[PDB]
């Protein structure tokens, strides 16, 4: 029963009947991740790209919560000074399961960002449903 107004249109007119678009993947989604900045916090960060992550039912517009091989902190008692965050940043809360921030993410985060999905791929996160598999690859060589 909500009523939505339709705005006044510009003078331009629709000149194309349809756009071809690549079909959205049904299960395994593969993403290109820029490494770090806090990838040195972990005992073995390449588990991030070696793991078939599974998307949990907790995923929403604030963030997508994965399960997989736990990531191990190099110093598990180390606290992080809270820092700015962005859509597609892959946080690793101290339980070791990654979270990929969505559009409604808080402006600053409390957990180390192990990587960020490239702008090429962030919008694919917008379509991944719970129960899909995710694979990650480093967008360029991670070296400390």
């Amino acid at each position: 029963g909500d009523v939505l107004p339709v705005g006044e249109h510009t003078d331009e007119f629709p000149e194309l009947d349809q756009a071809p678009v690549a079909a959205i993947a049904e299960d395994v989604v593969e993403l290109q991740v820029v490494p770090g900045p806090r990838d040195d916090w972990f005992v073995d960060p390449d588990i991030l790209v070696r793991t078939n992550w599974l998307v949990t039912n907790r995923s929403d517009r604030v963030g997508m919560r994965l399960v997989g091989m736990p990531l191990e902190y190099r110093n598990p008692d180390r606290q992080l000074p809270s820092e700015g965050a962005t859509r597609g940043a892959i946080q690793v809360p101290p339980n070791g399961f990654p979270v990929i921030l969505g559009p409604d993410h808080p402006v600053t985060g409390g957990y180390p960002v192990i990587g960020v999905v490239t702008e090429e791929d962030i919008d694919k996160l917008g379509q991944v449903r719970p129960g899909q598999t995710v694979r990650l690859h480093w967008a360029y060589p991670r070296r400390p």
Partner: protein
Amino acid sequence: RPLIGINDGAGARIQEGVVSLGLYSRIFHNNIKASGVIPQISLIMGAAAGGHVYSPALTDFVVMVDQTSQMFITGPDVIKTVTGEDVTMEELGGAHTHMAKSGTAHYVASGEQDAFDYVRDLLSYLPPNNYADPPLYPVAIPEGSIEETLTDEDLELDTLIPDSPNQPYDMHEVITRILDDDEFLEVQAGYAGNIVVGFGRVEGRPVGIVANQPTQFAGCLDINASEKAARFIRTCDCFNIPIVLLVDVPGFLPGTDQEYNGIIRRGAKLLYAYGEATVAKVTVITRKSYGGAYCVMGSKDMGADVVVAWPTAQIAVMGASGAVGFVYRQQLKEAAKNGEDVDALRLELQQTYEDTLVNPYIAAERGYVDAVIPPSHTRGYVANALRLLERKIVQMPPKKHGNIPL
């Protein structure tokens, strides 16, 4: 006689000298000689490294096993040394990589037995060589007219096409209904899914199907589909297998990525393959065939032998939305100056253009479509046409070989 190679190997045996490279050169030169003479099939069932990869590439069909086989020229350790890219051998050369990305594999078997079963299926369609007759199965042709012999499975085609020109449908619903037993051996099923290519039979005759798939990129042609279909067509033409095209193409896939990667140079491959091919070539047009993609997908002057269209076909230079902007730019300027309801005028003009010209009947009037048929007629029409066209003589200027755009 067909040659089957089963390939595993860590490339050249490094302790043997350049002799091993001489033997590679001889094996490659034989694959080139045999190219288009005998069916060549490569099974890859392990890591094929270095020179082991180029013989498969020169053979006609590549079958891989989905986790136990890889192909790569340069190993992960050299890639790491030269670029820093830390990659597993499966990510580098795996069967999924060579299907979905590189386009090299033709099939990805779930196991070795499944790979052998697919290779036997392939061999069952091919003749032993480019001059022997193809292996027809015995099929008894029923008597009476095409309209007298419609099955209920044919009548399921009359309701297939969605009413909206833009709602997609699975083209396999056509392919499996016009092929015998619904039997269809798809080739490169995982690669460039906007075009479907593969073998079937029509009244026992082997045929190659090439069909636009509306469910991917709305059926547009792109670089990968153009190469997928071009080599399949040239493989059928080597071995005298008739081709049947199912056309439903809105155009080429727009984008700067396609332009910068060479859609002009590599789309011209499918023109070359179809114009060169001298087998029987039947086109069935289902919905769209626009612009240059009409030329590519089996146009009459590209030497399509029989072209039939369904009532839902749409053969036009471009979609009416784009065409009206040229064809009536005068009236649209006058209406803009007069401050008229320009959008309502554009809708009136567009619906007039669609009703008048975006249909099969203009191409039928000009003889580019030999008949417009009820969709259910398609199986009978295609079979009857292949039976007419089973022998062709076509004159071509004498040449050493063509110069297909690479």
